[PDB]
Amino acid sequence: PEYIIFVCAVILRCTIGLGPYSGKGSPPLYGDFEAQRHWMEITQHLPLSKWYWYDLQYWGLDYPPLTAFHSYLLGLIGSFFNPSWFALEKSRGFESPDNGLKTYMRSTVIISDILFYFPAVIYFTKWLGRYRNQSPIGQSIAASAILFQPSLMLIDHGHFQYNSVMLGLTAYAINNLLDEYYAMAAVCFVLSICFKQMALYYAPIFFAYLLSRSLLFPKFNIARLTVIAFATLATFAIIFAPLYFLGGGLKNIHQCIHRIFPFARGIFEDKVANFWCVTNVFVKYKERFTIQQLQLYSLIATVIGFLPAMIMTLLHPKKHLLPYVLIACSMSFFLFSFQVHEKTILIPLLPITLLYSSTDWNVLSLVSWINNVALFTLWPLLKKDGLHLQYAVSFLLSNWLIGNFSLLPYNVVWKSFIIGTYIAMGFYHFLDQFVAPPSKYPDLWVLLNCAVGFICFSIFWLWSYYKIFTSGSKSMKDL
């Protein structure tokens, strides 16, 4: 009935994982498959007081403890099968002709995602449906659209990232917030932050929500505030205590804190759909300002872009403004941050894709369009890893089962802009394949890609800022 979608999704994730991973055939430093294999090799062979010190120049440890524990567990379960994979300094750059160790990892990612990402999202759509009396098919379609999101399905199965876990823990947090277990939503978010630290792009919203719900909105409830402030601290302490007691002491806490949050080197040296990749080609910030000034202006710029939403929640917290304020905050962090990368649009895409359960058609059209644009801004990354066939197959299937081949917001100024964005996409996959760069601007198509995505992201961002204020007017919670 409705369990064949949950199986077709896993078969899709399995078949997308027959293409080359990030870094195949690259001797000196392989891709992100080799980083993860190295962590699985390093955690189970060194004491807990050398994980963040061991070898910082060959794929050191960049993520908080929970990632280390995850890698330790998988490394044990995998060094059971074949030990010569995760050997210390011997099996460095391990590539097998049989394609062993390329199936074990591709299956560990599938398992971790099945555990930490499918139930969260499925229960979210179920709660929404049952609360709004959505036809079982109405829930099943909104739940199939959320599981075939191409950007994540290609950045995990095909590039080998463990992002489904970091996003599923945050979906658990949002579910707890819905069911009104705040003391446990605090804990699930503190876990989601300790897997990958790029989940701090929601803290400005979770904090305001919990605070206004505890001490401001209904009453000045001082017990709930204590329960939340103790859940947070107990979870932080239980996750960081193994580094302290079994590690070295405060030295280990300091080294981990500075491995997670590293200093910035360079100035706008990567091509992102940022506010700075797009204006650094006219203003040439490298020739006008210093790096201190740019690191200060980016902070002011991101804090001024998430303040209006943080305050709208902290002053009017409700359960129908959560997706929009989450978008308003995370996309603000993505557009104006000093150092952003091609990925990290998955963080703004979690709340976005969550809006595939809305009832309107303008909302669903904007959602599908921004998903296509988000996938499109990842072609330069998925083109140097192979993945030409998987990119196209996912790009086609996702749009097909939605109904995008049988569709736009309602206006003359919306349909035209959306069709123009599509026409300027379909003209980059023709200046990229056939016609050669001008030979005097070596990377001119990559810049058209950094630039044609920023416009769409910064229009969707303002659309969300509009929905926050036009809605939130004693609005439904059924819309």
Partner: antibody, heavy 122, light 110 residues
Framework: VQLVESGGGLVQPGGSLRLSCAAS????????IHWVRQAPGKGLEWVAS????????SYADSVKGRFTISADTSKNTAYLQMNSLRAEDTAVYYC????????????????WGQGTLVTVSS | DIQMTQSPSSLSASVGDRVTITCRAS??????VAWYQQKPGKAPKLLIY???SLYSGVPSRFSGSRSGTDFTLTISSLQPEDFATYYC???????????FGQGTKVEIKR
């Protein structure tokens, strides 16, 4: 808080040397050590770096491919290894610690060592 | 790729004069410019950092400043314990090399 150099003297042109810099009063796993030489009758010159929060090294092209700098993090020590030792290397070597912070705000080379003399000659 | 042009290499002054040393970088990509002093034979001593912030324990008469790429060190009252060599120094970020100026030997006049 005081650094101390050790190890340096008459070495034939072509030999090698291991300069040690013992730290005392602060942790070198957070201070981004630098080495800096002053030649006899010249101006202060920079040779090699080490960051120690990510182990990013960096050298002066004069001494690239011949020097190797590292830091023993447990015992709070820094080491420089000179291998080819051209004759244009006699100098007074200092180890200096520079403390950086968030948002690219540094505090300068506030702690110097009294320097040790290298005489690459014959 | 990263250099500092100190100006000049030699200038005389009497006990009490006001002194100013300039130092210009091939590109203004970081205001992390520190000013060090060195007596003959001893190790340098940090006078100013961040190009304007005075160290702790340094006299009050030392003031730095920046104008684009023309950093400057000002001694508003040159006292008898101020004749030495003075170096600028610029650094871009952590994993990057640094560079010292050439040296401005201040001496007494007669």
């Amino acid at each position: 808080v005081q650094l101390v150099e050790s190890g340096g003297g008459l070495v034939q042109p072509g030999g090698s040397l291991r300069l040690s810099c013992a730290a005392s009063g602060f942790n070198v796993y957070s201070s981004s050590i630098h080495w800096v030489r002053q030649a006899p009758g010249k101006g202060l010159e920079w040779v090699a770096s080490i960051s120690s929060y990510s182990g990013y090294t960096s050298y002066a092209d004069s001494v690239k491919g011949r020097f190797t700098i590292s830091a023993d993090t447990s015992k709070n020590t820094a080491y420089l290894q000179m291998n080819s030792l051209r004759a244009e290397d006699t100098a007074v070597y200092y180890c200096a610690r520079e403390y950086w912070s968030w948002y690219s705000y540094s505090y300068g080379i506030d702690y110097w060592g009294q320097g040790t003399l290298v005489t690459v000659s014959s | 790729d990263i250099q500092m042009t100190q100006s000049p290499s030699s200038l005389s002054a009497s006990v009490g004069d006001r002194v100013t040393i300039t130092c210009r970088a091939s590109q203004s990509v970081s205001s992390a410019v520190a000013w060090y002093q060195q007596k003959p034979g001893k190790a340098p001593k940090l006078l100013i950092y961040s190009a304007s912030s005075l160290y702790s324990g340094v006299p009050s008469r030392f003031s730095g400043s920046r104008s684009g790429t023309d950093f400057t060190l000002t001694i508003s009252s040159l006292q008898p314990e101020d004749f030495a060599t003075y170096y600028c120094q610029q650094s871009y970020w952590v994993g990057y090399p640094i560079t010292f100026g050439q040296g401005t030997k201040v001496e007494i006049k007669r």
